[PDB]
Amino acid sequence: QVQLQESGGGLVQPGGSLRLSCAASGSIYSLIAMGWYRQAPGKEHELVATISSGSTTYYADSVKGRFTISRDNAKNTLYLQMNSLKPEDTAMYYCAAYSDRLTDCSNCEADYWGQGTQVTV
Amino acid sequence: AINAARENLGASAKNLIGDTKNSPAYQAVLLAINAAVGFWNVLGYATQCGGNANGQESTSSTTIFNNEPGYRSTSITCSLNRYKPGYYGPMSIENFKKLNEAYQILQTALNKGLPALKENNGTVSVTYTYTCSGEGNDNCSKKATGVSDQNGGTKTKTQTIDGKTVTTTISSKVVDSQAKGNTTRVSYTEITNKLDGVPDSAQALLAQASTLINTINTACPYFSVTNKSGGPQMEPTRGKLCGFTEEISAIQKMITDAQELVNQTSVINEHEQSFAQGMLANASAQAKMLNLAHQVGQTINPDNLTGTFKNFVTGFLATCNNKSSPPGTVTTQTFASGCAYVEQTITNLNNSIAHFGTQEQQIQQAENIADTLVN
Incomplete structure (x- = not known):
């Protein structure tokens, strides 16, 4: 009912930066929050950052200070500015969202x- | 006068089972079917759905069904990930296919024309496509589909629909993400189905209507809707599809009534006009078809309805948000509207009855003459 598509991934030097993009489409009215996960080939998946319809952000300790979540409501797009990258940030980054079915579940x-x-x- | 009452029953049987535009019976059958199709058109778009072939959680599966009334779209996107399908959860792909097959038969046959109740051997072709994308999406694979080579493969089977043999062609086409033409730069698989020879009769479409509304009720998935800025509002905006208990009940009841109405058709056929029995069976049948027709009209009539359900009918089910489109028609703006001619059919049903008064008395007259004779 919602479809999410990422872009902006690539090769980057330690210290440098990237902005990741996500075009959302479909039942956007039904979402209560959006965010970014990541998983490294070895590791568990990790919730990176979220943004909740009031513009209230959550960041994982580990990216807090280095990464910024952000949306463009007009173009239905979700961003992740990533500064001062360390090799330990290498992973698949996933754009994600929370439907209003998840409302009471924190x-x-x-x-x-x-x-x-x-x-x- | 016994024979005048017989020419009258012959005449009114023809008005009931041979005609369409001006048959109460026909309009009642149409109203039941349209109410069912209209229901889905209203809420389909708000319904979550996903998972894999076995109704398990999928983390990557997006399955899209074409010519379906989705949000701003001619497809319904089943792309809910990470939670297993079930009651008050997403609808499974198994269920959605069952529902989609029925929806596609109904829209094609409504599009083509429901024949008169006596006309019972008509058939129609139905073709419908869906797509799978996402590593891990087994919804278009041999197991779920019957086709050997996912990459261009094609199988022709026979299946049975309403006790009739239907030749089904299935074909499977992968479109690589590199493919010239693929704007969604993601790999996907496209499944086409063609059903050659599907029954298009009052009876069969009523079974399809039945399967449609009853797959919904039983699967009972989560929905969330969005209201328009103006006009009728739906509140609450979030819950479970089977929570529309009154709409579903009424729709069930009109399908039952229309089904009961179709059975009366054979009694009439079996006694075209001691013979007194047949006269009675035929006359009683005709009276029952009129009783059931008026009842189908009353069930969904806005003047007999009250808050909430009334609102659902007058503001949603009996409307079309397509832009200004014949009976079978799906656009980016069908969602949250019935687009099944429900306003118009309610009208025509009540009017065919208005203009059936003399026939109602001729049928009633012959009932007595016949019953008299029987005793």
């Missing part, structure tokens, strides 16, 4: 997901 994980984009530092 620790449910997103029920919509993109196909992911690769960031190698």
